[PDB]
Amino acid sequence: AAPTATVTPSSGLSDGTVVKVAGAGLQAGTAYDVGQCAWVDTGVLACNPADFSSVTADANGSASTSLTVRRSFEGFLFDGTRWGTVDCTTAACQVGLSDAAGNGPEGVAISFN
């Protein structure tokens, strides 16, 4: 089984709901993180600490956890600085997983009606 991730709902969340992101086939033995982060530029990742979960890829590496994600969301910049409230109505925020080496599986693009 190859790595992947089932996240849902991807849209119709509304400010204050919870989405369920999952991973399957990830590095079987690598603690991956799981949350809502948006790329607003070349190497700019503003994530929100309200969906920051984490689990290690077990035998195959399945990780399913629910978290709260909305349109505007803390733009935590991976550099100690904060980018500001990242309005998901401007950029595309994906719900995905990752590890602490440099990168990991991808994220699912959510939508806000």
Ligand SMILES: CN[C@H]1[C@@H](O[C@@H]2/C3=C/C#C[C@H]4O[C@@]4([C@H]4COC(=O)O4)C#CC3=C[C@H]2OC(=O)c2c(O)ccc3c(C)cc(OC)cc23)O[C@H](C)[C@H](O)[C@@H]1O
């Ligand atoms: C290994 N580090 C690289 C990685 O960093 C990601 C990252 C971004 C950020 C931020 C700040 O909130 C903090 C802390 C760290 O310092 C602070 O001040 O706050 C964190 C973290 C992170 C954890 C990593 O998650 C991921 O790896 C990740 C990803 O690469 C792509 C999509 C992801 C998605 C969609 C979700 C997700 O769940 C967490 C993780 C990822 O991608 C950045 C673009 C840079 O290249 C970084 O050098």
